[PDB]
């Protein structure tokens, strides 16, 4: 409580949903209240990473109307948020960076918005909902440009390509992984390792080779995939529960972080062999974000309200 700035609420909701380092080195926090009287969420900026989750030593904070299902930095001051309310919302960070203020809140989805990714230009984003839709947004205009009912069940994860504005991956509980390219008149192409396996639950583009990605499934397996020869290259049984997130290090030879509902973090090399493992969390592991300053530092949040900083050999 030593700090607790204006507009910031006294208490941070127990269920830590997301953690993302800005390029300047500061830590963004999304969190939801998933039990108890009030079902809501809040947004946090921590210029002192080591100080989090302590509400006291934070740079800014704010209550959202509902819980936060996903979020992502938009450039440097922008916070884009996937809501329970069905809304995607933009929160603009202060010019002094001590207030977080609603930029827009658009109620466009019909169920919880579960997933959100920023497209490489930074002027547009794709959101994925339980309403089975995928939506493409103009951030400056505050509008949905395109709506896509490509899937047959709820969408789990949408991931913008690092470098091309019209390409992204989505995956849904209808067993499909769609490779998108909005320039085609039929934008989705179903490209899953096409033996109907286990439902895909998490996606991550390779940051260098703009044409390989990874997907994790509900069974704890992580898989490396080439888009051009589509013969699912590598796979390893990394987890004993669903794999909920996949995050590549900023290294030029990147390591892959992998988080699970088995409450464990793993770090894997480019051929998916296990380098690291952490049981430090005692509830679900929800996100992982690598330090821009120190490249062997990795931060995880969980539903155990732990913000944990890892040193990676």
């Amino acid at each position: 409580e030593w700090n607790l700035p204006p507009n910031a609420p006294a208490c941070m909701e127990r269920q830590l949903e997301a953690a993302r380092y800005r390029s300047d080195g500061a830590l963004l926090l999304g969190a939801s209240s998933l039990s108890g009287r009030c079902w809501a969420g809040s947004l946090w900026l921590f210029k002192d990473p080591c100080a989090a989750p302590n509400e006291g030593f934070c740079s800014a904070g704010v209550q959202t109307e509902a819980g936060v299902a996903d979020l992502t930095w938009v450039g440097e001051r922008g916070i884009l948020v996937a809501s329970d309310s069905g809304a995607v919302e933009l929160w603009e960070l202060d010019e002094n960076e001590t207030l977080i203020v609603s930029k827009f809140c658009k109620y466009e989805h019909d169920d919880i918005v579960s997933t959100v990714s920023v497209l490489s230009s930074g002027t547009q984003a794709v959101s994925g909902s339980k309403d089975i839709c995928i939506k493409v947004w103009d951030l400056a205009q505050q509008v949905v440009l395109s709506s896509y009912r490509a899937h047959a069940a709820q969408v789990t994860c949408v991931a913008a390509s690092p470098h091309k504005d019209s390409v992204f991956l989505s995956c849904s509980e209808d067993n499909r992984i769609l490779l998108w390219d909005t320039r085609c008149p039929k934008p989705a192409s179903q490209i899953g390792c096409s033996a109907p396996g286990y439902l895909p639950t998490s996606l991550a583009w390779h940051p260098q080779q703009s044409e390989v990605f990874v997907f994790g499934d509900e069974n704890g397996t992580v898989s490396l995939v080439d888009t051009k020869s589509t013969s699912c290259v590598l796979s390893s049984a990394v987890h004993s529960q669903c794999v909920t997130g996949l995050v590549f290090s900023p290294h030029s030879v990147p390591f892959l972080a992998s988080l699970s509902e088995d409450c464990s973090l793993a770090v894997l090399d480019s051929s998916l062999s296990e380098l690291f493992r952490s049981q430090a969390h005692r509830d679900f592991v929800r996100d992982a974000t690598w330090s821009p300053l120190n490249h062997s530092l990795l931060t995880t949040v969980g539903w155990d309200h732990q913000v944990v900083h890892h040193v990676v050999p």
Binding site: G67, Y107, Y198, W303
Partner: protein, 303 residues
């Protein structure tokens, strides 16, 4: 006058939300009893031992309010028919827990989805619950006229929507419901929540639900067209179905966000009320026969 209800999948505060939807005109609310995103673990350490509460308190409402105003929803992550053993186990327990909680609260009804062909294990767990304790609570199966897979935009390059008409495959959805109620041995406790889409199917695949115990019809906001003066209305063909459903007396459920930000939600609802007002009035027969619909009596033997 219609009896209608709001469907939400997000309730930040139960006290306020209920107020809003009463204010908006609705007779009742469909909401989750646990957070829809709050996946629980039942078997594996550590997550098993997650500190409680598991959900919000019953004290937040009066008994009266619970018995009369709240229809529960199954958490959408619960999948008793997963291919994955562990998920299937957690789902078994999770479903029990949510169901037991509805019973505890004395909810009048409770919604479960049929959104795939195979619901054998869902059926079993429900059948199990139904024969455990004594309660009169209703179970509404949320079944769509048209399967989600058959409503998808034709926008996958390498998986086109199979265009040629199939008499059977446009009925699949009924067979989903058929098998589920056959395995539950036609429990009187299990009824239908028919979900209407923008594409009303072939007239024959609607016929199908003739005779079935439809207790409720679910209208997504998305299917309302707009009149020349910016207000929500329905296509002529959708209007037919409404009059048919009204004849059979069911409850109507509005689901989804506002898509005509011009006015409140109460516009959608007003329109139903509008359609209900605009039925022909009962004939003399229909007035006499009113309380007798589907009520079996012995034939008289005046001899």
């Amino acid at each position: 006058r219609v009896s209608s209800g709001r469907d939400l999948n997000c309730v930040p505060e139960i006290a306020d939300t209920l107020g809003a939807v009463a204010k908006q005109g609705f007779d009742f609310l469909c909401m989750p009893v646990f957070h829809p995103r709050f996946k629980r673990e039942f078997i594996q350490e550590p997550a098993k031992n997650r500190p409680g509460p598991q959900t919000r308190s019953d004290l937040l409402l009066s008994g009266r309010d619970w018995n009369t105003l709240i229809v529960g929803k199954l958490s959408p992550w619960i999948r008793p028919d997963s291919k994955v053993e562990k998920i299937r186990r957690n789902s078994e327990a999770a479903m029990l827990q949510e169901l037991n909680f509805g019973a505890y609260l004395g909810l009048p009804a409770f919604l479960l989805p049929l959104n795939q062909e195979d619901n054998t294990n869902l059926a079993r767990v429900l059948t199990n619950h139904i024969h455990t304790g004594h309660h009169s609570s209703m179970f509404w199966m949320r079944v769509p006229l048209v399967a989600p897979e058959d409503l998808r935009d034709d926008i996958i390059e390498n998986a086109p929507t199979t265009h040629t008409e199939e008499y059977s495959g446009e009925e699949k959805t009924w067979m989903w419901w058929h098998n589920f109620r056959t395995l539950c041995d036609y429990s009187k406790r299990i009824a239908v929540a028919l979900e209407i889409g923008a594409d009303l199917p072939s007239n024959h695949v609607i016929d199908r639900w003739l005779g079935e115990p439809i207790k409720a019809a679910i209208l997504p906001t998305s299917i309302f067209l707009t009149n020349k003066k910016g207000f929500p209305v329905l296509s002529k063909m959708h209007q037919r179905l409404i009059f048919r459903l009204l004849k059979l007396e069911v409850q109507f459920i509005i689901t989804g966000t506002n898509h005509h930000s011009e006015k409140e939600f109460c516009s959608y609802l007003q329109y139903l009320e509008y359609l209900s007002q605009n039925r022909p009035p009962p004939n003399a027969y229909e007035l006499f026969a009113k309380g007798y619909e589907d009520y079996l009596q012995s034939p008289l033997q005046p001899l």
